[PDB]
Amino acid sequence: WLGMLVVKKAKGSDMIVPGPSYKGKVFFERPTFDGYVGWGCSSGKSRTESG
Amino acid sequence: FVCYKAGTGPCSESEEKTCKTSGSCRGDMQFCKVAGCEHGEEASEAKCRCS
Secondary structure, eight states, X not given: OOSSSOOBOOOTTSOXXXXXXXXXXXXXXXXXXXXXXXXXXXXXXXXXXXX | OOEEBTTTBSOOHHHHHHHHHTSOOOXXXXXXXXXXXXXXXXXXXXXXXXX
16 A cells, blocks of 8 residues: 555465455455465455355 | 255256366365366356365
């Protein structure tokens, strides 16, 4: 947001690291190896236990 | 590998055979790792969950 780096969109080729419980969550980011990507949902939806 | 549809139960032979042979199915990390899977979350009415 400060203009330092550039965030990348949600690419389907990225793997989600298991272990955290994504149930009840709405948005979460994961720093990948080639940049920074995020994962979110639409209105009225949330991730499951797997995410 | 056992497949079953959420709410309905075990699916018929056609969809499970396509899930096993084609590779465009939807499953857990083990299935996506040993046979590949497509997670494009496209418009669909139901999908036989395999685990």
